Design an enzyme around this catalytic site. Structure first.
Site, short mmCIF file in Angstrom:
data_model
loop_
_atom_site.label_atom_id
_atom_site.label_comp_id
_atom_site.label_asym_id
_atom_site.label_seq_id
_atom_site.Cartn_x
_atom_site.Cartn_y
_atom_site.Cartn_z
N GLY A 10 -11.95 27.04 28.86
CA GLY A 10 -11.78 27.47 30.93
C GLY A 10 -11.68 28.90 29.67
N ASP A 117 1.04 40.96 29.36
CA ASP A 117 0.75 40.33 30.64
C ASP A 117 1.73 38.63 30.05
OD1 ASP A 117 -0.58 39.58 32.85
OD2 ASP A 117 -1.87 38.67 31.54
N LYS A 119 2.35 35.42 30.66
CA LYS A 119 2.58 33.73 31.33
C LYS A 119 2.66 32.47 31.18
CE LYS A 119 -1.74 35.91 32.32
NZ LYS A 119 -2.78 35.86 32.96
N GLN A 121 0.51 30.19 30.22
CA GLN A 121 -0.39 29.77 30.22
C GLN A 121 -0.69 30.59 28.51
OE1 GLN A 121 -2.65 31.16 33.87
NE2 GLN A 121 -3.79 29.43 34.31
N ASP A 135 -2.39 36.39 23.11
CA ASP A 135 -3.10 37.47 23.76
C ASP A 135 -2.31 38.67 23.59
OD1 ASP A 135 -4.98 35.88 23.94
OD2 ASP A 135 -5.34 35.22 26.08
CL1 LIG Z 1 -6.78 29.46 25.06
C1 LIG Z 1 -5.92 28.90 23.57
N1 LIG Z 1 -6.13 27.74 23.61
C2 LIG Z 1 -4.93 27.02 22.56
N2 LIG Z 1 -5.47 27.65 21.73
C3 LIG Z 1 -5.22 28.75 20.95
N3 LIG Z 1 -5.38 30.07 20.24
C4 LIG Z 1 -5.71 31.71 21.51
N4 LIG Z 1 -5.77 30.85 22.51
C5 LIG Z 1 -5.43 29.95 22.80
#
Ligand SMILES: Clc1ncnc2[nH]cnc12
Length: 280
Positions: A10, A117, A119, A121, A135
């Site tokens: 995504g 940031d 969250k 997600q 992140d």
């Molecule tokens: Cl977005 C996402 N999805 C799975 N594993 C990850 N490691 C760092 N970001 C990730």
């Protein structure tokens, strides 16, 4: 060239995220394509390793495009919450996750690194019961529809020089969301976000937050709402939980509980590490 892209996970905060396989180790990773001080800042995050922080495996600058290679986890807290919507997340799993997140934050914060940031997600979960912050530190390196729901009030009032307290605020909001199965403050604009906070916690003033009225975006004209009780905001959470959440949601970032102090709170006296029920 060194990866096969398996699937597009995504479109994250900074660009597209791909599930990818390393063609010279076989390791499966998350590859984020980012849309020179930034390179140095980012490079430092390769050293910030902790079990509750998603590991930054590598940073690759080529064709002057930037790729971040991260540890892969199969689910995030947002999808886990959606999938638990009928039933709720059992309290001991809520408690375990909150404790592990606070350990992660205490670690980064002791190195003066903030997320900024947080969250649902961004919180990623595995099968062994672990939860990890993704992140981390990227907002400072790259700057930041984007969700406002987790933003601390000092950020919303225009403070340029906010502190590690901003993360504790976000994590409070996520705690309340795990408990209630509804976002705590789902603002759809900066002022709607502010007024949703004020409606719940009371419009802040000099009494609860010295200096608030001198913040860049503060207006004497904000409506004046009285505070509600946490018994009404996060039922049926117990008194320890509510006591902790209240300290994580103090308006004054100097009175807001630290991650380290929060790990000593009585809410965690009986904390355990359950294994979640996960379908991959
Ligand atoms: Cl977005 C996402 N999805 C799975 N594993 C990850 N490691 C760092 N970001 C990730």
């Amino acid at each position: 060239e060194n990866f096969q892209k398996v699937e597009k996970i995504g479109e994250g905060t900074y660009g597209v995220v791909y599930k990818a396989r390393n063609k010279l180790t076989g390791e499966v990773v998350a590859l984020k394509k980012i849309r020179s001080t930034a390179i140095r800042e980012i490079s430092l995050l390769k050293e910030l390793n902790h079990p509750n922080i998603v590991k930054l495996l590598d940073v690759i600058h080529t064709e002057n495009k930037l790729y971040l290679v991260f540890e892969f986890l199969h689910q995030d807290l947002k999808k886990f919450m959606d999938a638990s919507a009928l039933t709720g997340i059992p309290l001991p799993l809520i408690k375990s996750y909150l404790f592990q997140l606070l350990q992660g934050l205490a670690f980064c914060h002791s190195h003066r690194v903030l997320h900024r940031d947080l969250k649902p997600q961004n919180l990623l979960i595995n099968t062994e019961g672990a939860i990890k912050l993704a992140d981390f530190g990227l907002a400072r390196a790259f700057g930041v529809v984007v969700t406002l729901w987790y933003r601390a009030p000092e950020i919303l009032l225009g403070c340029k020089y906010y502190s590690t307290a901003v993360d504790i605020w976000s994590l409070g909001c996520i705690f309340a969301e795990m408990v209630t199965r509804r976002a705590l403050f789902p603002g759809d604009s900066e002022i709607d976000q502010l007024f949703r906070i004020f409606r719940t916690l009371g419009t802040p003033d000099e009494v609860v937050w010295p200096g608030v009225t001198s913040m860049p975006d503060y207006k004497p004209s904000f409506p004046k709402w009285a505070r509600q009780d946490f018994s009404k905001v996060v039922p049926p959470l117990d008194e320890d939980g509510r006591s902790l959440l209240s300290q994580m949601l103090h308006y004054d970032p100097n009175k807001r509980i630290s991650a380290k102090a929060a790990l000593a709170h009585p809410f965690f006296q009986d904390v355990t590490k359950p294994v979640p029920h996960l379908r991959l």
